[PDB]
């Protein structure tokens, strides 16, 4: 979630050269300079008589971002005789697979055709050029004397390669033994020491190679993709190979022993022609020191909303256990015809949280079918099924789909800030992009508030300017930050404090700060990483007890913090990111002390009654009608209590009776909102317990329709309380005479 996308670094190669088909890092042991290795399998080289012979470039990161080819092989086609070329380097696709250990570079040419030593043929045996800094050797493991289609003639060795930590080379040829596939493992030392330019079929010792099988395994393409990881007791790395056409084109993944090339486990797809094994990876995603297998099936079809299959692709995550058990889960694609599981690139601990992450790329997804790379972060339980980052290609297709995300590399820190980076190679536009992870800053925010219950009567506080001596309370807020890797010591933080949250709908504000005299107060903080609390004391004072609309809704405290994002690295302005799953805002609650029993809520009992005192009115006159209403709350406090007298279309309100002391002078109003006219009268806020109100309302009635026979009123008390907030509706009838 922290990969920088605003300003990545792009590398452009020769047009139509498939630059960026295979990407990798360069980590020289004898130098401190870090380079990017990028393959250009269709580029043009200076070799004599070789056209589109492919090349491998090394591109700097901080030196003009220029790309210079590596001179693995500066010669042309060797001659077996007077006029008899021995090898054919034209259109050999050199650079289709680039791997790099500390000082070693293994660039392979899958389509290199070599005329046999027996008959004039053209067989894509494939060659690999191993480079150890100074001594560049040629490693063709399946250029042997058993040359035919039945053997390693169409080996295409170097289609998929990998490096084990014990200085061993894993090589995969999907064409050996009638396209059954092969895995060849030779030690780097043996390869370098056994090189001899005058002999083409060199036999290495300590060679682990898979053998031929029955004819029912043909066209399985074993070695289409190879990964390396440890999957048994010993510390020797085992070989994981994708076999995408195995088991009647279902797909499979073979795991072989890293000591003597013996099969250990097997994975199988569920859908035909889904290409299960196109890309495989072996990384520890839950951080219990046990490698986990990730298998990509970019052509997987799953049922949609209407039950029709849609090609979205799938990635299967198999979590290793203490025994041979694997807890396999499926990660379905997101867009149809996107090839989700095309390339799987373990990023290592991208955000430095403890568990390694992973990036799976759909190279034909997104808008304009440019390309999408998803990023899934590993957790203790396993792999998060929701991507935490989306990377979009930004180069439109010219003649071929850009294929952004067809091949990526990860788990190598190139700017030395402590976070692994990612190279994404889009060869449809001949581009390579380097995404550098931003530092992750976690924040442990805190918001300590004074006791939630606020007493309105308790007014032992001072005020500026007027000294009204009203109630006040204090709010304490503070936060710490700490992140791994390179990070500036002092991080600028600004915190905004909002008073009476979840109520900003044009209403009034009740709680208000003592000094700023505003519901909002912002302050700047320069906190130090890994430090203790840095808490400032703020004082807020409530308004008048009879000023705000209601005292029921709790007062909410809101504190939102945002990183300055100007604490960027001096290298390329890499601004640190905040942790993705932590909230960026803290909300606390406050209550206004109100005697409401032990349940902490006021539950009133509202009663209303009325007598006629006239019991009859004459039709033709405007008769003065006075209704004696008794409004009593025998329950607890009733907040914002008013009685509702919904008079009919006939009469209208005149005024409250004030000529007698037995009745009250209730403040009353005439309302007409929402299709109904009615009379409201304030009953007290709040309306205390056991309070019995008695008052009279004068009216004036003049009949509408000559056959009406009655005048019916409706009386009801309602309050803004949450439970038992309304009185039973009482209907009073006056008979026309």
């Amino acid at each position: 979630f922290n990969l920088d996308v605003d300003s990545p670094a792009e590398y452009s190669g020769p047009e139509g050269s498939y630059f960026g088909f295979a990407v990798d890092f360069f980590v020289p042991s004898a130098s401190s300079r870090m380079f990017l290795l990028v393959g250009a399998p269709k580029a043009n080289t200076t070799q004599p008589g070789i056209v589109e012979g492919g090349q491998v470039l090394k591109c700097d990161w901080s030196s003009t971002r220029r790309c210079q080819p590596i001179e693995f092989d500066a010669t042309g086609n060797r001659d077996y005789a007077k006029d008899d070329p021995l090898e054919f380097k034209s259109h050999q696709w050199f650079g289709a697979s680039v791997r790099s250990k500390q000082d070693k570079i293994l660039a392979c040419a899958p389509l290199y055709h070599w005329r046999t030593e027996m008959k004039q043929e053209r067989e894509p045996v494939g060659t690999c050029f191993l480079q150890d800094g100074t001594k560049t050797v040629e490693y063709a493991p399946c250029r042997s004397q058993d040359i035919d289609a039945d053997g390693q003639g169409f080996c295409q060795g170097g289609f998929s390669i990998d490096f084990t930590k014990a200085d061993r080379v894993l090589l995969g040829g999907p064409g050996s033994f009638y396209w059954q596939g092969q895995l060849i493992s030779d030690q780097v030392a043996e390869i370098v020491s056994k090189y001899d330019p005058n002999v083409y079929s060199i036999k290495y010792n300590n060679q682990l190679a898979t053998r031929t099988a029955q004819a029912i395994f043909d066209d399985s393409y074993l070695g289409y993709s190879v990964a390396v990881g440890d999957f048994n007791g010993d510390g020797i790395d085992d070989f994981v190979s994708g076999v995408p056409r195995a088991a009647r084109t279902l797909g499979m993944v073979y795991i072989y022993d890293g000591k003597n090339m013996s099969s250990l486990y097997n994975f199988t797809g569920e859908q035909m022609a889904a290409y299960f094994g196109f890309s495989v990876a072996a990384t520890d995603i839950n951080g219990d020191d046990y490698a986990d297998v990730f298998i990509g099936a970019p052509l997987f079809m799953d049922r949609g909303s209407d039950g029709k299959l849609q090609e979205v692709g799938q990635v299967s995550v198999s979590l290793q256990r203490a025994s041979g058990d694997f807890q396999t889960t499926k990660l379905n694609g997101f867009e149809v015809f996107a090839r989700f599981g095309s390339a799987i690139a373990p990023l290592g601990d991208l955000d430095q949280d403890g568990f390694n992450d992973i990036a799976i790329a759909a190279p034909y997804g997104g808008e304009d079918k440019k390309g999408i790379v998803y990023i899934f972060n590993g957790r203790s339980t396993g792999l998060n099924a929701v991507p935490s980052q989306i990377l979009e290609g930004q180069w439109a297709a010219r003649s071929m789909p850009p294929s952004f995300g067809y091949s990526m590399k990860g788990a190598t820190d190139i700017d030395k800030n402590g976070y692994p980076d990612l190279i994404v190679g889009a060869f449809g536009v001949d581009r390579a992009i380097l995404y550098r992870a931003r530092p992750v800053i976690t924040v442990n925010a805190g918001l300590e508030v004074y006791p939630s219950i606020l007493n309105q009567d308790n007014k032992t506080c001072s005020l500026p300017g007027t000294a009204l001596k009203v109630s006040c309370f204090n709010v304490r807020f503070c936060l710490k930050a700490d992140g791994k890797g390179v990070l500036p010591r002092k991080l600028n933080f600004q915190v905004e404090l909002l008073l009476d949250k979840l109520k900003q709908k044009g209403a009034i504000r009740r709680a208000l700060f003592l000094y700023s005299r505003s519901p909002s107060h912002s302050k700047n903080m320069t906190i130090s990483r890994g430090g203790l609390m840095q808490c400032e004391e703020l004082i807020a004072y409530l308004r008048d007890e009879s000023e705000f609309r209601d005292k029921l809704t709790p007062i909410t405290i809101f504190m939102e913090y945002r990183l300055d994002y100007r604490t960027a690295a001096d290298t390329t302005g890499l601004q640190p990111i905040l942790n993705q799953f932590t909230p960026a805002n803290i909300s606390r609650q406050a209550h206004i002390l109100l005697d409401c029993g032990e349940d902490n809520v006021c539950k009133p009992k509202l009663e209303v009654s009325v007598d006629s005192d006239q019991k009859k009115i004459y039709i033709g006159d405007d008769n003065p009608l006075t209704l004696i209403v008794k409004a009593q709350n025998q329950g607890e406090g009733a907040y914002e209590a008013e009685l509702i007298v919904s008079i009919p279309l006939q009469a209208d309100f005149i005024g409250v009776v004030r000529n007698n002391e037995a009745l009250a002078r209730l403040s009353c109003a005439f309302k007409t909102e929402n299709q109904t006219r009615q009379v409201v009268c304030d009953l007290g806020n709040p309306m205390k317990a056991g309070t019995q109100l008695l008052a009279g309302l004068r009216f004036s009635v003049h009949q509408q329709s000559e056959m009406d026979t009655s005048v019916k009123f409706d009386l009801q008390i309602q309050s803004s309380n949450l439970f038992d907030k309304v009185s039973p509706v009482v209907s009073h009838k006056v008979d026309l005479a």
Partner: protein, 49 residues
């Protein structure tokens, strides 16, 4: 004896159409007639090579 024929599994002749030698690559499978225990060459396969 039963001669352990490629199509004469056990001793009885197998059904006509059984494959005795699966074809590797774009080639023609070798079938057995069901009256001879051997694996006969496919008639129209080449120059009877």
């Amino acid at each position: 004896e039963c001669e352990s024929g490629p199509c004469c599994r056990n001793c009885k002749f197998l059904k006509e159409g059984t494959i005795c030698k699966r074809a590797r690559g774009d080639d023609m499978d070798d079938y057995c007639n069901g009256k001879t225990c051997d694996c006969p060459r496919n008639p129209h396969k080449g120059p009877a090579t």
